[PDB]
Amino acid sequence: EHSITRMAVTNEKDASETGDNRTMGRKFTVPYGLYRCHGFISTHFAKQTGFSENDLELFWQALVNMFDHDHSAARGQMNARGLYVFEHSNNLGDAPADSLFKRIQVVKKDGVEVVRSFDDYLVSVDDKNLEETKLLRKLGG
Amino acid sequence: IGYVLGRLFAVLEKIQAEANPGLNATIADRYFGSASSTPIAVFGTLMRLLPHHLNKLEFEGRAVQLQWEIRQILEHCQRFPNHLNLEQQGLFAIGYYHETQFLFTKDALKNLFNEA
Amino acid sequence: GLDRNRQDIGYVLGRLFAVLEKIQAEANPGLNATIADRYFGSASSTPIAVFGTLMRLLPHHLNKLEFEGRAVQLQWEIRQILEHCQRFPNHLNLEQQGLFAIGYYHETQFLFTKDALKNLFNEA
DNA sequence: TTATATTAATATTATATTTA
DNA sequence: ATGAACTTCAAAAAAAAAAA
DNA sequence: AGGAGGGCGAGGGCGATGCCACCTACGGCAAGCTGACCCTGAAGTTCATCTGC
RNA sequence: GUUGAAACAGGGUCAGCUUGCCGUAGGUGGCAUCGCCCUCGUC
């Protein structure tokens, strides 16, 4: 929650007065946050929308690379730190989704009290039992 | 750890406004945005302004009273937190207003000091 | 509200400065510029700067203390504090920055709580 | 808008290593 | 013939401190 | 040769370790947009459809 | 086994876009460590 300053008022303010024109404002930043999105690419709705395997590799590329390209003063630096996809053999689910998401457990590093980077997190995947018929394809991690 | 630092900010700004009656940049207007949300960034430096404000209090006994209550406030504080959760920046604001209307109570600080 | 065994160098230095000013303000209570008023700004941030000079300056306050046993009272807790201070840190960490003010006011409370120092000394 | 005068303050410890 | 589809119906509705 | 190699007691006394003020000034903490689309109705009839004739 | 059943909040939508905390300000001015004290008394 950084209080930035602007050295130019925007409008003819109630206070755009004599000396300086200033519109301080706020530039909130996360000093670091390892956000864990869970995602579900369901075959059943891939049937009604025609979501192709091509349209899916485009989405994989998008997730891996979409912060390298969507930058701003507001968000500064965001990175895709890992995309662990669980491709199930059936258009049903081989396993419950959350059984596969707890499978990718991300914990702050051993003794970091506050996290500053991905280096202060540990993303341990569990590819030991999903071989039931499933595929964990690790795209970013 | 947010409410007691709100109280701490209230006493700190009261001491400043008691030291300098007419201030253009009270430690509210200057340090609040980061004392509310980021107490180590500020309260480590508000409280270097503090001995000078207490020195400048024309009634040195009033300085003693205000320093006593900031001791009491800060006795509930074991460490200024690095960052105040959204839960506590509300406390800080509530703590600030609570303590600042305690200070601007009739005889509240004089009394509370005198029962110690 | 005083962790006498905190070991947080900022907190122990705050405690140390609190007792240092307690001695100065008991050495001559009528004092224009206590070490809070003249040294605290860096004692909280640059403990090596002052805290050396604060203890050039300390034995003389202990002398100026009217009650010669009160000098032992306060010097004893200076030592109690300084067991926790293996070194005056060059620059107080920011956590320690704030914990110095914490220590100043925690130990100042401990000194201005009536029997605390005279009691706690007698358990040593 | 208000409010705006001083807390606490009396001693720790204290009896000999080394000597072809 | 029953039940969805459709066609009419009708035409918004609006605030908010003193202090004697 | 056999010497004796100090014995004694003092090693601070006194007071002062601050005085003075200052610890801020100034102003800005927003601008601008949006705050939702869409539907879903009663009530009635039609109209397509079904059953029975 | 004759008595309110059936019933979605849905489908989905970056809060963005960005903005110096600043310009700057002596810690000063100054203050005696002092006043003084047989190493003695003697073998």
Automatic annotation (TrEMBL), chain A:
Highest rank taxon of the organism: Bacteria
Record GO biological process: maintenance of CRISPR repeat elements
Full-sequence portion shown in this chain: 144 to 283 of 283
Residue ranges of coiled coil: none
Protein name: CRISPR-associated protein, Csd2 family
Source lineage: Bacteria, Pseudomonadati, Pseudomonadota, Betaproteobacteria, Neisseriales
UniProtKB/TrEMBL annotation, chain B:
Name of the protein in question: CRISPR-associated protein, Csd1 family
Organism this protein belongs to: Neisseria lactamica ATCC 23970
First and last residues shown, out of full length: 467 to 582 of 585
